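[09:14] KT: can someone run the structure on this one? pasting the chain below
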Amino acid sequence: EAVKKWVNKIIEENIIAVFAKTECPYCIKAISILKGYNLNSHMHVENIEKNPDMANIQAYLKELTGKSSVPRIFINKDVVGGCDDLVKENDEGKLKERLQKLGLVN
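[09:31] RB: done, structure tokens below
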């Protein structure tokens, strides 16, 4: 219960929620892409590797999304997925459309 509630709170209280690990180039690239849209003020990154419950968090992220890997990216509670999914959405205009719908980009 506690782990799920905590993960939920991160996803529900931040429009952009990224679960990450330490020294991961795909975590870093995804966060950099998102900050490139000047999303900092509505973004929260959680390093779940520096956490005693990493495996529980990853298992719950798999329950929510189908994958246990980080980065795990949510936008207004919708699952974007990993960095590869973010790159596809970014290159194909879907990311910008999401952010426009949220008033985050004009």
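[09:33] KT: thanks! Residues 20 and 29 are 11 Å apart (CA to CA).
[09:34] RB: yep, looked fine to me
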